[PDB]
Structure 1
Amino acid sequence: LPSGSDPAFSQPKSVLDAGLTCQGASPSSVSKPILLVPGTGTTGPQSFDSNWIPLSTQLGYTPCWISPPPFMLNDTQVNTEYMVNAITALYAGSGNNKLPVLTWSQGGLVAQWGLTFFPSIRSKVDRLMAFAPDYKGTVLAGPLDALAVSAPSVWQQTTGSALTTALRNAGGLTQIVPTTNLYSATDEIVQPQVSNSPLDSSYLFNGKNVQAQAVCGPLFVIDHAGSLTSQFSYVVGRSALRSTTGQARSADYGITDCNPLPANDLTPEQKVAAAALLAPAAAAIVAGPKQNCEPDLMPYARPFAVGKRTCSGIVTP
């Protein structure tokens, strides 16, 4: 795995700091923070205020989130700078204590990219709880790329991209901190996810990989948004956050938790917002930036994707 010093940031610190917010606290002084990393086409609040912001609060954490502009549609490598900066800030701001990271969709890819290429945060992240992470990207973005209607981060999240290749070759498909991955075979955004094996996009070696259908059966259906908001997802997430091993425990969930509806502890208002979670994301992607090539890899990642093609040309170290 990459070692040594962290690569330099491309964005100024004041800009990176501006993308971090905590509920009822400044990042410089916060009690038991949990860092939430949003999905493609959303801001932190859009991804989590109908679900894990109120739910993590009820578990004793102070939710904090990053909102890389515009709506996580830009270069995933830059989105990661927001996360690395945030971990550095929240670790110090909480009395030099490790903190958990909880993610949805692209957020999981951002977290794993950060842990792989920025060594300094490895001892600052307590555990990772990723919902519907696309570590190997998704094959469904292929046609959008070919139609030239894909945002920078959509190109990068396409299976076979230079970015996903670099992650794999650097050793990023094995967990770095205790990780739990919750995903669904019926995900309509991230595929392939149907094998319940290392071939799935959400799978990490040595991680606690939980495909919903492996527990609840082939007739259990939860979509991309439901992977984050369902009652089943809540039970697994709570297990991961409370676990002494840093990963969700099988003894903590079962058949009776196979409920696809939004988490029981959410208020009626929060449940309505959670049900329509994907609406703002769909709108942001259609209105957002689009290009006809994958963004170039930063210097620190180039040696791990030699031979791939990005906007500027063929990747060389």
Structure 2
Amino acid sequence: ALPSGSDPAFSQPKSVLDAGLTCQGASPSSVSKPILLVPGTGTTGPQSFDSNWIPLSAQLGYTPCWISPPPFMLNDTQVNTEYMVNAITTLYAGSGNNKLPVLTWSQGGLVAQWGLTFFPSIRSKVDRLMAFAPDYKGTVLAGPLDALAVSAPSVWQQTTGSALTTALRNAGGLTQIVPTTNLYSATDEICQPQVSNSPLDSSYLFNGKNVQAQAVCGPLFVIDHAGSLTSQFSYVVGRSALRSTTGQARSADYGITDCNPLPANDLTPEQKVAAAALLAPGVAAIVAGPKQNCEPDLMPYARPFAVGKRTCSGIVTP
């Protein structure tokens, strides 16, 4: 069974969580058909989505909303999740007490599933999850000890084997909690392993709609970590998932003819250029951000699920 009962307390003051939430042309507290966008590591909401799902979700009839947890999604993934939980509580009420879809890139999907696993109050407020290149198992390519003995807190947590990914898995988080679509690529240069088209893949959730692009488009089809978010193929799958009556993308809605790895057709020329350039801010932000030589401690609500792991303060104990 999943964690149940009360939501964990926020470590951040709520006013700080509110400051990280924005909607385009609307207040989060009075918004029609919001979609909550959760960005990837090293980026803000606008940096992740200005070139793709902010305009694309608008043209599908949603009000694009996003969180930008400081600094650039580099802090503790457990803190980034508080931004999302507060945003769901706010947007649910602000939209007339209606469930809303959540759309994510990279760590944003890990954040979404962490929130669903450990904050039971939001399960009934999230309609569906559309995750592009989510690293629910982390990645073996993270290299928190690569080129420098200190790395951002969330880089430690997204390393395969981390206490965080261990606790997510042991608490039941690798099975979908709301209707979920995961779109990912075997050629992802940031998140691996993704090659098996099976539960071994970091983006795979049991009972989710798990769409490895090469399983539809062929073994030699190439989209990278950013293209998993921005490509025309990704748009067709994401549009399917958002419109589906089941809450998940439908195999009937996309096919080999949608296997275009370039930025979504409906983007402006300036958006397509920006979409192709995606990753660079969120490679550089690392440089100027918080860095440490250990994985952040697990919050008490998650510690029983990673017994035997090791974090900054010592051995994980319940």
**TM-score, normalized by length of structure 2?**
0.98
Kept in 2: contact 1:148–1:290 (CA 8 A): no
Residue 283 of structure 1 and its aligned partner are, at CA, apart by 1.1
Q: Does the aligned pair in 2 maintain the 1:99–1:126 contact within 8 Å?
A: yes
Question: Does the CA-based 8 Å contact 1:84-1:121 persist in structure 2?
Answer: yes
Offset of 1:144 from its aligned partner?
A: 3.0
d(CA) in 1 for partners of 2:246, 2:261: 26
Farther off after superposition, 142-151 or 20-29: 142-151
> Cα offset for 1:146?
8.4
- 1-structure distance, mates of 2:49, 2:246: 25
| Aligned equivalents of 2:75, 2:146: Cα separation in 1 | 15
Give the stretch that moved more between structures: 8-17 or 144-153.
144-153
Q: Deviations over 1:15-50 (max 9, x none)?
A: 000000000011110000000000000000000010
The superposition leaves residues 264-293 of structure 1 with CA deviations (integer Å, 9 ceiling, x where unpaired) of: 000001001000011111111122221110
| Alpha carbons of structure 1 residues 299 and 145: separation in structure 2 relative to 1, 3 Å | farther
**Count of residues in correspondence between the two structures:** 317
Deviations 1:210-252 (A, max 9, x none): 0000000011000000000000000000000000000000000
Partners in 1 of 2:273 and 2:170 — Cα distance? 42
CA RMSD of aligned residues (A): 0.9
Provide the C-alpha distance between the structure 2 equivalents of 1:172 and 1:143, rounded to a whole number of angstroms. 23
Map 1:101-140; keep pairs closer than 5 Å: 101-140=102-141
Identity across matched positions, percent: 98
State the alpha-carbon separation in 1 of the partners of residues 52 and 100 from structure 2.
19
Query: How far, CA to CA, are the matches of 1:300 and 1:258 in structure 2?
Result: 42
* Structure 1 residue 142: Cα displacement: 3.4
Q: Is the 8 A contact 1:162 1:297 kept in 2?
A: yes
String of CA shifts for 1:90-133, please: whole Å, max 9, x gaps. Answer: 00000000000000000000000000000000000000000000
1:148 shift after superposition: 1.6
Q: Is the 8 A contact 2:139 2:193 kept in 1?
A: yes
CA contact (8 A) 1:151 1:290 kept: yes
C-alpha distance in structure 2 between counterparts of 1:148 and 1:123, whole Å: 41
Where in structure 1 do 4 or more consecutive aligned residues deviate above 2 Å?
Answer: 142-147
* Counterparts of 1:304 and 1:30, CA distance in 2: 37
Q: Is the Cα–Cα contact under 8 Å of residues 144 and 150 in structure 2 kept in the other structure?
A: no
Q: Which runs of 5+ in 2 are unaligned?
A: none
Instruction: Please tell me whether the aligned partners of residues 181 and 210 of structure 1 are also in contact (alpha carbons under 8 angstroms).
Output: yes
Q: Distance in 1 between matches of 2:190 and 2:4?
A: 33
